[PDB]
C-alpha cells in the first residue's frame, strides 16, 4: 500500500487532461455550460482562498514569537539574501536565454513609481479589518493629482508586515504575552487540520478545474503562432528549477536535492493546476514539515514571506516576455536597456501578487520602463493560463528550497535554544 | 417576568397605536421618529448575531464531541437531527401550501454552495456572494451586502469539530470560545431587558400604518399554521417514527408522559421540567435509567422540534407578508439555519427572538417585521415547549431499541 | 529624549521647508512625493487605533470593576468623569466662541445613537451609518466609510463590563485582552520612534504649500485657546468644585500643593511625579494616607484633565482650519471620544499623538493636519501636565469630605 493523497491527484491530472480534450472533439458546449462544468473547480478555489487568512495570520505570529528577537534578525537576514540571490539568477538566466534564442525576430506582425509606492502603502494599511479583504490602488489623474481608492483582494503584504511586528513584540513580552503564543499556536494547528480536509477534496476539484481550463476555443495560437516564445519561458523555467535551484541546495546542504523535490510533489502539482502560489501556500506548509521534516520555526517565517516576495518564476517570465515584446519591434536593446530590464523585473516580481493572472498587471511596469506602450500586452493574453501554471510550480519550489537552505545555514541558532 | 413585560408591551403598544392615529395627524417623517426606540432594538439584535453565531457553533459542536458516549451518544444526536429536519420540512411545506400572508433556479442553488465556502472569512461577516446570468450568456458575481450566515455556520462547524479532535493542544481555543459564548449570552440578556421598551414603539408604528382589518386575518392564519404544524408533528409524525423502529403502540407511550406535558405548560421551560420528566419516563414507561440520564439532559437544549418548525414558518410568513416567493435557494437557507439554531443558541430560552433574526438575516428579509411574530409569540410559546419535550420523551424509547445490545454489556 | 527629538524634527522640517520652496519649484506631483514619508506615518497611526480602542476599552473597564473599593473607590471614579467632561465642555465652548481658524439637527442626533449600536461589528471597524432626509419626507441610510469609533467604544464598554462580572468563567478573556493591550502599546512605541522622521517630511510639505502669514496667526490663537482653557479650568473651575463640597478655601489647598506643581513642570510626566505629590499632600494639606494611596495611583492614569480639554480644542481647530462647522452631532462625538480617551490610552504619555487621531477619525476630519498640532505641542505639553496633577491634587481633598463616614468605620 502507499499514499492516496498524491496518487489520486496524479490520477485526476490524467483523468482531467483526457476529459477537457475529449469533450471538445465530441460535443459542443456553450459558454454557459463551460462554466457549470468547471464548478467543482471553483469550489476548491474558494475553499483555498478561505483558509489563507487564518493561516498567514497564525503562522507569521508563532513563527517569529518562537525566536528570541536576535535569532529572528538572522533568519530574516538569511531569507532576504536568499530571495535576492535567486530572483537575480532567474532574471539573468532569462535574459541570456531570450537574446541568444531570439524568438521575436521576423515574426513582427504575427506609472512605475505609483506602482512601487503602492507597495509601501500596502505594507502599512489604514485598517486591519479592511486589510483582510481589500487592497489599496493608486491612480494618477487631473499637473496631476494623486487619488487612490480601495479595490478588492486580500492585502497579503500588510498582514505579513503587521504580524511580523506583532510576532516580535509578543516574543519580547515574556510571561505577560504567553497566552497570545498559546492562542496562535492552537489556531495554527487548527487551521492546518482544515487544510487536511481540503486536501481530500483536492483530487475531485482538480479533475474539473483542469478539464474546464483546456476546454477553450483554439489550440493553434498556443501551439504554432506564438510558438518558440513558450520555448524560451519553459526552457528557463526548466533549467532554473531542475538544474539551478537544486544546485544552490546542493552547495549548502549535502542531502540529495531531488529527494527534497520529490517530497514536495503535492504542492508542486497543485500550483501546476491552480496557478496561484498564495492559494497553494497551505499545501506547501503541510508538504514541507510533514514530508521533508524541515523545522517548524523556519517554515512559518520563510514560506509566508516567500509567497509574496520571492517570485522567481514571475521574474524569469518578466525578463523573457518583455524582451520578446520589444523584439517584435525593431528596437536595439542596448547595454543600458538590458540592465534596467533585469532591475525593474526584480521589483515587479516583488510587487506581483500570488493571485491568478497576476503576471500581466506587473508586466505593464516592466514594459513602460523600457518605453513600450501598455496596450502591447494584448499579444500575451492568449496563452497565459498555461504559462501561469508552470511559473507557479517554480515559485512554490523556490519557497520550498529556501526552508531547507536556511535551516542548514542556521542549524546552530536553532540548536541554541535549549531547556 | 419577561413574558409579563412583553404582553404589557403589546397591550400598551396597541392602545398607544390607536390613541395616536385617531387623535393626531403625523407626516411620513414623524411616523419614522415615533418608531425610533424600536429601530434601535432591531439593530441591537443584528449587532449580536455575529458573535452569537461564531461562539455558539464552535462551543456547541465541541461539546458534542465530548458528550458522545460511543454508540448511545451517537444515536441520540442522529435522532435529534432527523426530527428537527423533518419538523422544518413539515413547517416549510405547510406554510407554502396554505400561504398565509399573501393577497434561473440553477444559479440560485449554485449560489447556495458558493456561500457555504466563501472566499474570505471577514467578508463572510457582512457580505454575500450573489451571481447574475447575463450577456450565449456570461456569469458575473457581485458580492452584495448582508451577513453570510451559511458561511459562518459551515466554517464554525468544521472549526468546532477540529478543536474537539485536537484535545490538549486546542484546550485554550475551547476555553476562549466558552468564555466568549458566556459573554455574548449575557449581552443578549441585556438586550432582552430593553426589548419591552422597543416592542412598544415598534408595535405602535405598525398600528399607525394599517388601514385594513386584513393584517389580523393574516396573523390569525399564521397561528393556525404553527398550531397545525405542531399538531401534525406531535400526533402524526413523532408517533410514526416511534412505531417504525419500536412496535410498541406510541400513544400508550404518550399517556405515560402525561405528568410531564402538563408541567411543560405551567413552567414553559424545557430544561426546568427535567426532574419530573426523568421520573415520569421511568415510573410509567419502564425505560432504562442509563439512557434517561443522558438523552433527557442533552435533549432539552438540543432537541428543539417545536422551535425549529415555528422559526421555519415565521420566516416564510414574513417573506409572504412582504411580497416574495423565495425561489428555492432561500428556502434551503431557512431549512439549514432553523435546523442549526438548536446549536446556535447554547441552551438559553432568552435567545428565541435573536435566533429568528438569524433566520431572517440569512435570507435578507426585513427584520422590523418580527414584531408581528412577537405580538403572537406569547400565545404559541406554551405549545412549542410541549412539542420540545415530546421529542425528548419519544427519544428514550427509540434509542433503547437501537441500543439493546449496549444495555447487556455496559453493566 | 522624545521631546528633544520632536523639536529637532520641527526645526529641521522648517529649515528644509524654506530651502526647498524658496530655492526650487515643484509641481502638484512632486509636492505629493515629498510628503510621502509623512503619509506613511499617517497610515501607521490609523493602523494601530483599531486594536488600541478594542483592547484598552475592554481591559480598562474590566480593571475598574476590580479596582473600586466600595464607596471610596466609586466616588473617585465618578469625580474623574465629571471633571473630564467639564474640561471638554469648557474646551468646546471656548474654541467655538473664539473661533481660531476662520477667515437637520435632529438627523445628526439620531445618527449619534444609530452609530453607538451598529448593525455589524466587523463593518463598525471601517464603516459608519449616515442618514439622508429626502423624498412628506423619507429617510434613507447609506453606510459611508470611516471607522465607527463610537460603536467600538460603546460595545467594548458593555463587553468589558460583562467580563468583569463573569469572574472565573471570563478570566481567559481578561488575560487575552491584557496581553493584546500590552502588545499594541509596544507597537505604538515603535511608531513613535519613526515619528520624528515622519513629522520632518510632513511639516516641510506644509511650509511649501503656504503663501501667507495667516496660518501662524491661527496657530497663535490656538495656543491662546488651550492656555485660556487651562487657566479657566485650574483657577475658576477646579477651585469652585472644591468649594461646593469642601468649604476650606481652595487656594490655600493649592498653595499647599506648590511643591508638587513645580516638579510637574520639570519632569513633565504625571506618573513619574507620584512620590513627590504623595508626601506634599499629607505633610501640608493633612490628607489621610488611606485616601491618598488610592486616589493618586489611579488618578495618574485616568484623570487627564488638561489632555482632554486640549484634545477637544485641537479637533475643532482642525475642523475650522478645513472649512467646516460640525453642526452638533459631531461636537458630541468630540465630547465622548476625548472623554473616553482616558481609558482608551492605558496610562501612557507616549500615546498623546495617537489618541488625537482617534478623535479626528471619530468625526471624519483629515488626520494629516495633525502636524500643526504637533508643531506647537512641545510648547503646551508642559502646561497640560500641571493641570493633570492638579486634578489629582484637588481630588484627594474632595473625596475625603464625601467619605468621612468611611474613615471612622474601617479603622
Ligand atoms: N499566480 C502566479 C502569478 C504570476 O506570477 O504570474 C504566481 O503566484 O506566481
Ligand atoms: Na527569489
Ligand atoms: Na514564491
Ligand atoms: Na511578489
Curated annotation (Swiss-Prot), chain A:
Tissues in which the UniProt entry reports expression: Expressed in all tissues tested including liver, muscle, testis, ovary, retinoblastoma cell line, neurons and brain (in which there was dense expression in substantia nigra, red nucleus, hippocampus and in cerebral cortical layers).
Localization per Swiss-Prot or TrEMBL: Cell membrane; Apical cell membrane; Synapse, Synaptosome; Early endosome membrane
Domain of life according to the entry: Eukaryota
Extracellular-side segments: 24-46, 211-230, 325-337, 372-384
Residues annotated for Na(+) 2 binding in this entry: 308, 349-350, 352
UniProt record, GO biological process: adult behavior; behavioral fear response; blood vessel morphogenesis; brain development; cellular response to ammonium ion; cellular response to bisphenol A; cellular response to cocaine; cellular response to mercury ion
Residues at which L-aspartate binds: 275, 277, 314, 355, 391-392, 395
PROSITE patterns: NA_DICARBOXYL_SYMP_1 (PS00713), NA_DICARBOXYL_SYMP_2 (PS00714)
Protein residues bound to Na(+) 1: 83, 86-87, 306, 310, 312, 395, 399
A single GO cellular-component term on record: early endosome membrane
Keyword entries, A-Z: Amino-acid transport, Cell membrane, Chloride, Disease variant, Endosome, Glycoprotein, Membrane, Metal-binding, Phosphoprotein, Potassium, Schizophrenia, Sodium, Symport, Synapse, Synaptosome, Transmembrane, Transmembrane helix, Transport
Post-translational modification as stated in the protein's UniProt record: Glycosylated.
Catalytic activity from the UniProt record: K(+)(in) + L-glutamate(out) + 3 Na(+)(out) + H(+)(out) = K(+)(out) + L-glutamate(in) + 3 Na(+)(in) + H(+)(in); K(+)(in) + L-aspartate(out) + 3 Na(+)(out) + H(+)(out) = K(+)(out) + L-aspartate(in) + 3 Na(+)(in) + H(+)(in); D-aspartate(out) + K(+)(in) + 3 Na(+)(out) + H(+)(out) = D-aspartate(in) + K(+)(out) + 3 Na(+)(in) + H(+)(in); K(+)(in) + L-cysteine(out) + 3 Na(+)(out) + H(+)(out) = K(+)(out) + L-cysteine(in) + 3 Na(+)(in) + H(+)(in)
Residue spans, topological domain Cytoplasmic: 68-78, 174-182, 253-257, 289-297
Family named by the database record: Belongs to the dicarboxylate/amino acid:cation symporter (DAACS) (TC 2.A.23) family. SLC1A1 subfamily.
Domain text: Contains eight transmembrane regions plus two helical hairpins that dip into the membrane. These helical hairpin structures play an important role in the transport process. The first enters the membrane from the cytoplasmic side, the second one from the extracellular side. During the transport cycle, the regions involved in amino acid transport, and especially the helical hairpins, move vertically by about 15-18 Angstroms, alternating between exposure to the aqueous phase and reinsertion in the lipid bilayer. In contrast, the regions involved in trimerization do not move.
Protein name: Excitatory amino acid transporter 3
Organism: Homo sapiens
Gene (name only): SLC1A1
Curated annotation (Swiss-Prot), chains B, C:
Primary location class: membrane
Binding site for Na(+) 1: 80, 83-84, 299, 303, 305, 388, 392
Sites carrying sugar chains: 25
Binding site for L-aspartate: 268, 270, 307, 348, 384-385, 388
Keywords annotated in UniProt: Amino-acid transport, Cell membrane, Chloride, Disease variant, Endosome, Glycoprotein, Membrane, Metal-binding, Phosphoprotein, Potassium, Schizophrenia, Sodium, Symport, Synapse, Synaptosome, Transmembrane, Transmembrane helix, Transport
Protein task: Sodium-dependent, high-affinity amino acid transporter that mediates the uptake of L-glutamate and also L-aspartate and D-aspartate. Can also transport L-cysteine. Functions as a symporter that transports one amino acid molecule together with two or three Na(+) ions and one proton, in parallel with the counter-transport of one K(+) ion. Mediates Cl(-) flux that is not coupled to amino acid transport; this avoids the accumulation of negative charges due to aspartate and Na(+) symport. Plays an important role in L-glutamate and L-aspartate reabsorption in renal tubuli.
Name of this chain's protein: Excitatory amino acid transporter 3
Species per Swiss-Prot/TrEMBL record: Homo sapiens
Gene name of this polypeptide: SLC1A1
Amino acid at each position: 500500500k502507499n499514499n492516496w493523497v498524491l496518487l489520486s491527484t496524479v490520477a485526476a491530472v490524467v483523468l482531467g487532461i483526457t476529459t477537457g480534450v475529449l469533450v471538445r472533439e465530441h460535443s459542443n458546449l456553450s459558454t454557459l455550460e463551460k462554466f457549470y462544468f468547471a464548478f467543482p473547480g471553483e469550489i476548491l478555489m474558494r475553499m483555498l482562498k478561505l483558509i489563507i487568512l487564518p493561516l498567514i495570520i497564525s503562522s507569521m505570529i508563532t513563527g517569529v514569537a518562537a525566536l528570541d528577537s536576535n535569532v529572528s534578525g538572522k533568519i530574516g537576514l538569511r531569507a532576504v539574501v536568499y530571495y535576492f540571490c535567486t530572483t537575480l539568477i532567474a532574471v539573468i538566466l532569462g535574459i541570456v536565454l531570450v537574446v541568444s534564442i531570439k524568438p521575436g525576430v521576423t515574426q513582427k506582425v504575427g506609472s512605475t513609481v505609483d506602482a512601487m509606492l503602492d507597495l509601501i502603502r500596502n505594507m502599512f494599511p489604514e485598517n486591519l479589518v479592511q486589510a483582510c479583504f481589500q487592497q489599496y490602488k493608486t491612480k494618477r489623474e487631473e499637473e496631476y493629482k494623486i487619488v487612490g481608492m480601495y479595490s478588492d483582494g486580500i492585502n497579503v503584504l500588510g498582514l505579513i508586515v503587521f504580524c511580523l511586528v506583532f510576532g516580535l513584540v509578543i516574543g519580547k513580552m515574556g510571561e505577560k504575552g504567553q497566552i497570545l503564543v498559546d492562542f496562535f499556536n492552537a489556531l495554527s494547528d487548527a487551521t492546518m487540520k482544515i487544510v487536511q480536509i481540503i486536501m481530500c477534496y483536492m483530487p475531485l476539484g482538480i479533475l474539473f478545474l483542469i478539464a474546464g481550463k483546456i476546454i477553450e476555443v483554439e489550440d493553434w495560437e498556443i501551439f504554432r503562432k506564438l510558438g518558440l516564445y513558450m520555448a524560451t519561458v519553459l526552457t528557463g523555467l526548466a533549467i532554473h528549477s531542475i538544474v539551478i535551484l537544486p544546485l544552490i541546495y546542493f552547495i549548502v546542504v549535502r542531502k540529495n536535492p531531488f529527494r527534497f523535490a520529490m517530497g514536495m510533489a503535492q504542492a508542486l502539482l497543485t500550483a501546476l493546476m491552480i496557478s496561484s502560489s498564495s492559494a497553494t501556500l497551505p499545501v506547501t506548509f503541510r508538504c514541507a514539515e510533514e514530508n521533508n521534516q524541515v523545522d517548524k520555526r523556519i517554515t512559518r517565517f520563510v514560506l509566508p514571506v516567500g509567497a509574496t516576495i520571492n517570485m522567481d518564476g514571475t521574474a524569469l517570465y518578466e525578463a523573457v516576455a518583455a524582451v520578446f515584446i520589444a523584439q517584435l519591434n525593431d528596437l536595439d536593446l542596448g547595454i543600458g536597456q538590458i540592465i534596467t530590464i533585469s532591475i525593474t523585473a526584480t521589483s515587479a516580481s516583488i510587487g506581483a501578487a500570488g493571485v491568478p493572472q497576476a503576471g500581466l498587471v506587473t508586466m505593464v511596469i516592466v514594459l513602460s520602463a523600457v518605453g513600450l506602450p501598455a496596450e502591447d500586452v494584448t499579444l500575451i493574453i492568449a496563452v497565459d493560463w498555461l504559462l501561469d501554471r508552470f511559473r507557479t510550480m517554480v515559485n512554490v519550489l523556490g519557497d520550498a528550497f529556501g526552508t531547507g537552505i536556511v535551516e542548514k545555514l542556521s542549524k546552530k541558532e536553532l540548536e541554541q535554544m535549549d531547556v
